[PDB]
Write a protein that binds this ligand. Structure first.
Ligand SMILES: CC(=O)O[C@H]1C(=O)[C@@]2(C)[C@H]([C@H](OC(=O)c3ccccc3)[C@]3(O)C[C@H](OC(=O)[C@H](O)[C@@H](NC(=O)c4ccccc4)c4ccccc4)C(C)=C1C3(C)C)[C@]1(OC(C)=O)CO[C@@H]1C[C@@H]2O
Ligand SMILES: Nc1nc2c(ncn2[C@@H]2O[C@H](COP(=O)(O)OP(=O)(O)OP(=O)(O)O)[C@@H](O)[C@H]2O)c(=O)[nH]1
Ligand SMILES: Nc1nc2c(ncn2[C@@H]2O[C@H](COP(=O)(O)OP(=O)(O)O)[C@@H](O)[C@H]2O)c(=O)[nH]1
Ligand SMILES: [Mg+2]
Lengths: 149, 426, 426
């Protein structure tokens, strides 16, 4: 019963993280999205910032002329609403971890300086790639809920 | 350089376009045969923008004509200026959209789009350097709304870095012409907001006002209404096509006119708007023109400007004038209408002075206003639409073409979003 | 010989240029044909023809196309006239980051070639506008490149500054500030003229009721002719470009002298006048005659220079200066007693056929620094703060290779500048 709550502590220690990461979903302006839709030759910082969320959904293309198409489409807004990294694959997340743990753009200072158009969404992308971490927090102990529970 | 690819979709689009071409043709000295017979070298200095030359001084608008029916575009051909088009540029099917957005976008027009896009692609590659795409397309029809909007989407995907401007003719709540005008407009707008850089919203009501009061034509022909909008578009694009003391690119206008990504809708005007023989009383001056332009009677939009404040203004004058006069004149104007200029933006107005008059008026002007007031136009349509959606009315025509209630709800959301933003920046 | 380079950038630059090269030709005695020591501004060709030592750049080909068809056409070798594809459209981020980082390299080439010609390359003159799209980013970019190349060379900046009242363009305020961020740390000296003040001068002193851009430009150009003629001509006390920099930059950061070119006198005002040396001095110091919208009495002239031309004799000048020093109204800075340099040149200004001015035997361009220009800075900072509170037109710039943080830093710089001037005044 002591270990029965320690395996239930994991959902509680990720509770501040999950809530704040899903608070980065709610802190989204409709105007800020379309600034990206109206941007043709962006800063290299904001370009990488959308490459962060490009492969989160699963688009390997990196050209700005070609990546603006996913941004341009109207599928892009509702998918950001309901999004969970719990269902996001580990392998792709690993690619999201490897690439984005090297980013100057991941530093909340570079994005903010570049634009406030990319500001809260990188604040989401840090929270959302850290939602991948919440997945990697809960899941290496979920096995304890499958055999030890 | 900086050439524009015209488009005309739906009877309305097709007809304004018809008259539009005729108008630009006269301005650049081109006759009905596609031959040049003009005395102004400046016409052929920058003919490029609006025409391709071929063998034997052949001239040809870079214009694509689209109609889901053949009829309206076959009338085009019969017309005097109709034979200036290279007939390969009329792309039509033979199933009418019949004032159904779903027929235009999803079904009948999805079949005819690919062919049209091929014609689009011809034109882009034939450009020294493509600037923009002008689409004259009604909002409230079938071939303007659905087919028009579908055309815009695909074109934006193909050339995202370029200008998309649409002189979109909108419903007038006081003179509705079609049943589901609300449906067509709402579905169109939801797409348009996201797919264009600038849209000049012209309703028939305002045109009538102009004709009746000022031009004193108490028998408006669609011809006359069209002649009006035509001149508007010519004025917009005069700078690209003629040398100037200060020259406003289409992009320049967009950049100067638009506070935010979204609120790109405009109200064009024109001056001098006078009847024949009502000009001898007048005398053409910069003040005169400005006064005419800033008057409500010379607005080609639904909204009364004074029911709101202009966010920005861009007055693209024509003919030979003193920059100083214009500057000094529009400074007075900023001051007088303190109530109807938004605070956010000092130097609200943006003057551009083309050095070319419109072949028969010693001076002229063209207004472009961005007013918070235009929220009212959207309100009217939102209201009209909403009530009918309450009874799920006419639904069967659209559900039949694959469209869904949730879509409509989302279109309503779009409308609501547009009106709230204007309220915020009131 | 001491020899120079011209760089006209942006519509304004080139338009100013059109005026400038007319003047020089009329002075040195060159026809538009190029047929006839002018070494400074004309480089002699193989035989007979003389070629202007100039660079003519614009992204808007419209402007320089007018150049290529004007009577001033065959004067310039078309090595000079560079063209770009599309205009900067009042975006600093298109002038600098996009269309700039494309055509800049070609321009750097032409510059280098011209530099090779010059035996004794004195320096540069950069006609641009703080508040056009071209001249706001592109100018800064060009300046940067030249600094990297030469460094030690003289660089001068005839900057059409925003008139606090008069309106051209909505984003105008943003552009200036970005330019300032970058310009002030390259150009060792920057003579800034706004159009409104020039218009004032046009209306009052010349009695002209229609101030065209042409006329406004001829005046600006006559400011530059006087600055040069010390190089271009013989005479006692001859000044050099380096001399100004050394004279009129009390602290290495602050270098924004105002300019006034008296007499500004019409065909009438020639009679009812005698045009004495000391008359013209007083006129120059007049609060109304400043070529900026700045009142010089709202601070202290830090250090002043006066470039008399034609039949000017030194002592007369010296007595007028005594008088000027005497007047306690016209405040000077405590810490430098004698704040003048006088250059007297035997060449008088020669006036353009079909123009504002009549043959004034004596003339003087006073290039005076003042702490009083801090008023025009503040105004502009305010205009920018107001629009950047709403973050308006943000989207245009950002999406063109810019930083939001760049906007913030620019203001910081302005604050620092203002603070420095305050210190100096104290
Ligand atoms: C001597 C004189 O003043 O003649 C004018 C005239 O009397 C008035 C009434 C003209 C006249 O305009 C109209 O009749 C009209 C009717 C409905 C909608 C718009 C115009 C004119 O017909 C129209 C005509 O316009 C032109 O010639 C322009 O080039 C115009 N294009 C055409 O009219 C045109 C007609 C057929 C085929 C091709 C072009 C234009 C305007 C702006 C931009 C591009 C082109 C002009 C100057 C006049 C008349 C003949 C009376 C006015 O319009 C124009 C465009 O000039 C009406 O408002 C002005 C005020 C003018 O005073
Ligand atoms: N003196 C003078 N100033 C001008 C002239 N034309 C424009 N200006 C000024 O220049 C600014 C307006 O922008 P422009 O200089 O025309 O723009 P640009 O540098 O050509 O940039 P783009 O139009 O984007 O290519 C304002 O300060 C105008 O007052 C002109 O002929 N003479
Ligand atoms: N200004 C103008 N409007 C027109 C013209 N013809 C039709 N319209 C408007 O177009 C609207 C109907 O759309 P329409 O494009 O005809 O439908 P479609 O034929 O199915 O494309 C109506 O509100 C008419 O007022 C015209 O020649 N000029
Ligand atoms: Mg220009």
């Amino acid at each position: 019963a002591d270990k029965q709550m320690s395996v239930k502590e994991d959902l509680d220690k990720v509770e501040p993280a999950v809530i704040e990461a899903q608070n980065a979903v709610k802190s989204i302006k409709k105007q800020h999205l379309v600034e990206v839709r109206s941007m043709a030759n962006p800063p290299a910082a904001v370009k990488l910032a959308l490459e962060s969320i490009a492969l989160l959904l699963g688009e390997s293309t990196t050209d700005w002329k070609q990546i603006r198409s996913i941004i341009m489409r109207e599928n892009f807004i509702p998918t950001i609403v309901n999004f969970s990294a719990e269902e996001i694959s580990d392998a792709i997340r690993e690619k999201m971890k490897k690439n984005y743990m090297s980013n100057p753009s991941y530093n909340y200072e570079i994005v903010n300086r570049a634009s406030l158009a990319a500001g809260p969404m990188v604040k989401w992308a840090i929270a959302q790639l850290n939602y991948a971490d919440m997945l990697k927090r809960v899941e290496p102990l979920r096995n304890e809920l499958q055999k030890l529970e | 350089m900086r050439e524009i690819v015209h488009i005309q979709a739906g009877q309305c689009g097709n007809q304004i376009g018809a008259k539009f071409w005729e108008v630009i043709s006269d301005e650049h000295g081109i006759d009905p045969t596609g031959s040049y017979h003009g005395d102004s070298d400046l016409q052929l200095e920058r003919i490029n923008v609006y025409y391709n030359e071929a063998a034997g001084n052949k001239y040809v608008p870079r214009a694509i004509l689209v109609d889901l029916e053949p009829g309206t575009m076959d009338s085009v051909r019969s017309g005097p200026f109709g034979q200036i088009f290279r007939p390969d540029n009329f792309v039509f099917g033979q199933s009418g959209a019949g004032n159904n957005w779903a027929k235009g976008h999803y079904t009948e027009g999805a079949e005819l789009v690919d062919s049209v896009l091929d014609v689009v692609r011809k034109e882009s590659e034939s450009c020294d350097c493509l600037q923009g795409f002008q689409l004259t397309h009604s909002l409230g029809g079938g071939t303007g709304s659905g087919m028009g909007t579908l055309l815009i989407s695909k074109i934006r995907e193909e050339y995202p870095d370029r200008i998309m401007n649409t002189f979109s003719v909108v419903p007038s709540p006081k003179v509705s012409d079609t049943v589901v005008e609300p449906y067509n407009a709402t579905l169109s707008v939801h797409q348009l907001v996201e797919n264009t850089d600038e849209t000049y919203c012209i309703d028939n009501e305002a045109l009538y006002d102009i004709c009746f009061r000022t031009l004193k034509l108490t028998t408006p022909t669609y011809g006359d209404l069209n002649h009006l909008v035509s001149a508007t578009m010519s004025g917009v694009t005069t700078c690209l096509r003629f040398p100037g003391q200060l020259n406003a690119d289409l992009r320049k206008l967009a950049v100067n006119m638009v506070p935010f990504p979204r609120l790109h809708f405009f109200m064009p005007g024109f001056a001098p708007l006078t009847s024949r023989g009502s000009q001898q009383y007048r005398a053409l001056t910069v003040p005169e023109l400005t006064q005419q332009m800033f008057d409500a009677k010379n607005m080609m939009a639904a909204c009364d400007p004074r029911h709101g404040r202009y966010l920005t203004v861009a007055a693209v004058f024509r003919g030979r004038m003193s920059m100083k006069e214009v500057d000094e004149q529009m400074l007075n104007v900023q001051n007088k209408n303190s109530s109807y200029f938004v605070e956010w933006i000092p130097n609200n107005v943006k003057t551009a002075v083309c050095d070319i008059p419109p072949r028969g008026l010693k001076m002229s002007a063209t207004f472009i206003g961005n007013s918070t007031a235009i929220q009212e136009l959207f309100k009217r349509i939102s209201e009209q639409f909403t009530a009918m959606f309450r009874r799920k009315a006419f639904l069967h025509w659209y559900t039949g073409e694959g469209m869904d209630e949730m879509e409509f709800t989302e279109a309503e959301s779009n409308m609501n979003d547009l009106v709230s933003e204007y309220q915020q920046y009131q | 010989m001491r020899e120079c380079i011209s760089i006209h950038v942006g519509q304004a630059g080139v338009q100013i240029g059109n005026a400038c090269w007319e003047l020089y030709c009329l002075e040195h005695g060159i026809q538009p044909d190029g047929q006839m020591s002018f070494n400074t501004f004309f480089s002699e060709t193989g035989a007979g023809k003389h070629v202007p030592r100039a660079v003519f750049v614009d992204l808007e080909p419209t402007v320089i196309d007018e150049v290529r068809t004007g009577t001033y056409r065959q004067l310039f070798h078309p090595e000079q006239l560079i063209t770009g594809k599309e205009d900067a459209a009042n975006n600093y981020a298109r002038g600098h980051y996009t269309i700039g980082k494309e055509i800049i390299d070609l321009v750097l080439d032409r510059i280098r070639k011209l530099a090779d010609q010059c035996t004794g390359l004195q320096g540069f003159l950069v006609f641009h506008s703080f508040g056009g799209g071209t001249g706001s980013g592109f100018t800064s970019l060009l300046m940067e490149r030249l600094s990297v190349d030469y460094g030690k060379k003289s660089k001068l900046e005839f900057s059409i500054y925003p008139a606090p009242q008069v309106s051209t363009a909505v984003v105008e305020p943003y552009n200036s500030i970005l330019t300032t961020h970058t310009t002030l740390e390259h150009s060792d000296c920057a003579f800034m003229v706004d159009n409104e003040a020039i218009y004032d001068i046009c209306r009052r002193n010349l009695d002209i009721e229609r101030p065209t851009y042409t006329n406004l430009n001829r005046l600006i150009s006559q400011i530059v002719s006087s600055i040069t003629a010390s190089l271009r001509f013989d005479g006692a006390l001859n000044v050099d470009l380096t001399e100004f920099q050394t004279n009129l930059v009390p602290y290495p950061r602050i270098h924004f002298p105002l300019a006034t070119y008296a007499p500004v006198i019409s065909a009438e005002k020639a009679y009812h006048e005698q045009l004495s040396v000391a008359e013209i001095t007083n006129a120059c110091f007049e609060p109304a005659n400043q070529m900026v919208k700045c009142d010089p009495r709202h601070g202290k002239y830090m250090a002043c220079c006066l470039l008399y031309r034609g039949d000017v004799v030194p002592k007369d000048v010296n007595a007028a200066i005594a008088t000027i020093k005497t007047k306690r109204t016209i405040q000077f800075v405590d810490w430098c007693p004698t704040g003048f340099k006088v250059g007297i040149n035997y060449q008088p200004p020669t006036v353009v056929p079909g123009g504002d001015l009549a043959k004034v035997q004596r003339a003087v361009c006073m290039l005076s620094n003042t702490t009083a220009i801090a008023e025009a800075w503040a105004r502009l900072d305010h205009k920018f703060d107001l629009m950047y509170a709403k973050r308006a037109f943000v989207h245009w710039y950002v999406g063109e290779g810019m930083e939001e943080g760049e906007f913030s830093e620019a203001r910081e710089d302005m604050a620092a500048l203002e603070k420095d001037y305050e210190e100096v005044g104290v």
